[PDB]
Amino acid sequence: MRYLELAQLYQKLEKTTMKLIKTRLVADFLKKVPDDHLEFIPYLILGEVFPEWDERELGVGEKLLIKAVAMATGIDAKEIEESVKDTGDLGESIALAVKKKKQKSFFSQPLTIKRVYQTLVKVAETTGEGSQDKKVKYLADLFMDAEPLEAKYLARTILGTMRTGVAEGLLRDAIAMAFHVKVELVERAYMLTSDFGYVAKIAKLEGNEGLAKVQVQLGKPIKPMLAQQAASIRDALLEMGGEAEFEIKYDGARVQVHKDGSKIIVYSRRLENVTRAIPEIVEALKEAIIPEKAIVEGELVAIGENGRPLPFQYVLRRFRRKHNIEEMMEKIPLELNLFDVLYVDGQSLIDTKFIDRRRTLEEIIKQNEKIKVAENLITKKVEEAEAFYKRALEMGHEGLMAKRLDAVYEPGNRGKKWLKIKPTMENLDLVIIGAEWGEGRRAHLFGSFILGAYDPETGEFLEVGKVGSGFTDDDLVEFTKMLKPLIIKEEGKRVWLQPKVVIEVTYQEIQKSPKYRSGFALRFPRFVALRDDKGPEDADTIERIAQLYELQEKMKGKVES
């Protein structure tokens, strides 16, 4: 299949604002894709080369890209740069360079999707000595045969700036539509493997039966099972049927570990491969995990000099690797509190009752300085769990998790099989979808941020509030530098932003406002932290908010006596 057909799809996608039309376009295209392109085509359709959990990345910036295009077209980098000043878009200017290339090298050897994909992969894997020059050459080889339209999309694909309105929801729907399979099964398989390519392939070749048989695949992250919040230990035990597994709810960053022999991959909550950020934990895991193959997950916690937990922000700091891992391992010691096992030696435990998974976890983990098994208590006595809860809080943790003993693991689901019990309404993790410049001496900084809750089915982020409290001057400076590149529209003090930054905020109250489309509004939110271990698509949803609203109202309804 020619890359031109894919470029033509991108163009059609950009020419419609309609999700249903986009779904159709993508589905029709998926139907034409050769079977051996299915494993990667979904990502290319999203304008990405690899799944977010891959670790591989094209180490190509605007300059290197321009250099490759200049090399491929015979047009000076400066000229391409000067073109951007008139076009306002590098993609369009690259298309022009390629269009002009016709004068000196008129015939192209038509780009195939296969060649483009294989090239991008080679580029990403070229990190050796003179990786940069090699990447320029691979890309130049590609742009030499590109048609203008193709070049524009190849460029945006390389830069990660593709703007097709295709989100995971639409891609899921497109796969279901293209191969006449149940969207629920496409979703089930996606929650288990986080791999749209894998899911699409199976959908096409095996249909529903195949999708229903999909099991976790070692190395591919499983979307984490989430939890609803209960008002109290008592309420949690009641919901559980009178008995439950209780565990300390550790305040750190959730990670998922895949082990194959001595090979370890650790994924963060947003499924970023963060293995490289925590070498000491990886080493500890090779030792702590007994079975050759396993997938387990836990809460990675920063530990202070007094042995108590440090703020979870410290763990997220470790993930960003802004300082040398060497210094940070010293400055920010970590401990991983494992709380689930989803696979062991070729056997998926997703459909295994929790009690068996926990027993397996206890059996498979030889705890060490770094790797621990979450402390638990299985009880039917509210007072026992309450004592455990009190202790969890005195220990500096968040409270307790209560988990149904007979429940299977539900990838990506925020059900009631796992419940969180805390002393306060949990903070919301929302997407910054806009901001407003501050006033007076703060006019050069964003001083307020519009928060959006993610909508999976639609892919958009609906406004649920505006936070302008809790940020120190430095926070404002940092967020302004971080968000300026995301501006997509500006109007007075108001700026609209690409939905990419998730932040945690407290709120005085969740209000059910007829006002906004979301139906909700947060009363006086306050900044708590940057939650970059969560992608925009991992942010709290309207449903999550509605759930907290119900909890809030349930408690207000109980006020007095």
Ligand X SMILES: Nc1ncnc2c1ncn2[C@@H]1O[C@H](COP(=O)(O)O)[C@@H](O)[C@H]1O
Catalytic residues: 249
Give how far Cα 204 sits from Cα of 112, 169, 427, Å: 21, 18, 41
Q: Within a 10 A sphere around the Cβ of 129, how many other Cβ atoms?
A: 8
CB of 501 to ligand X, least distance (A): 18
**Which tokens in the block code for residue 409?**
């693991």
Q: Is 357 annotated in some ligand binding site?
A: no
CB 345 within 8 A of CB 292: yes
Is 247 labelled a binding residue? yes
Say whether residue 190 binds ligand X (CB under 6 A). no
**For ligand X, which stretch binds (CB under 6 A), given 29-37, 79-87, 100-108, 243-251?**
243-251
Residue 114 annotated as lining a ligand binding site: no
* Options 157-165, 219-227, 361-369, 444-452: segment touching ligand X (CB under 6 A): 219-227
CB of 375 to ligand X, least distance (A): 9
414 contacts ligand X (rule: CB under 6 A): yes
Interaction of residue 227 with ligand X, rule CB under 6 A: yes
Helix axes 77-87, 90-101, angle to 10 degrees: 130
Strand, coil or helix: 104: coil
CA nearest to 119, candidates 75, 34, 60? 60
Out of 145, 299, 463, 537, the only residue in the binding site for ligand X (CB under 6 A) is: 299
Q: Counting contacts by CB under 6 A, is residue 245 touching ligand X?
A: no
- Quick one: 19 or 223, whose CB is closer to ligand X? 223
Which phi-psi region, left, alpha or beta, contains residue 31 (left: φ > 0; alpha: ψ -120 to 50)? alpha
Q: Among the candidate windows 38-46, 148-156, 245-253, 462-470, which touches ligand X by CB under 6 A?
A: 245-253
Other beta carbons within 10 Å of 63: 12
In the complex, the smallest distance separating the C-beta of residue 475 from ligand X, rounded to whole angstroms, is 23
Q: What values do phi and psi take at 500, rounded to 5? A: -130, -25
CA 486/CA 355 separation, integer angstroms: 45
Q: Which of residues 475-534 bind ligand X (CB under 6 A)?
A: none
Instruction: Give dist(CA 70, CA 88) in Å, integer.
Output: 18
Contact residue for ligand X among 204, 220, 254, 270 (CB under 6 A): 254
Q: Does 250 bind ligand X (CB under 6 A)?
A: yes
Does residue 254 have a known ligand-binding role?
Answer: yes
Q: Which of 226, 295, 342, 432 binds ligand X (CB under 6 A)?
A: 226
Which of 401, 419, 539, 545: binder of ligand X (CB under 6 A)?
401
9 in Cβ contact with 33 (< 8 Å) = no
Q: Is 374 in the site for ligand X (CB under 6 A)?
A: yes
Residue 71 burial by CB count (10 A; 0-12/13-18/19+): exposed, middle or buried?
middle
Residue list, annotated binding site for ATP: 247, 254, 269, 299, 339, 414, 420
Residues found near ligand X in the complex (CB under 6 A): 224, 226-227, 247, 249-250, 254, 299, 339, 374, 401, 414, 420
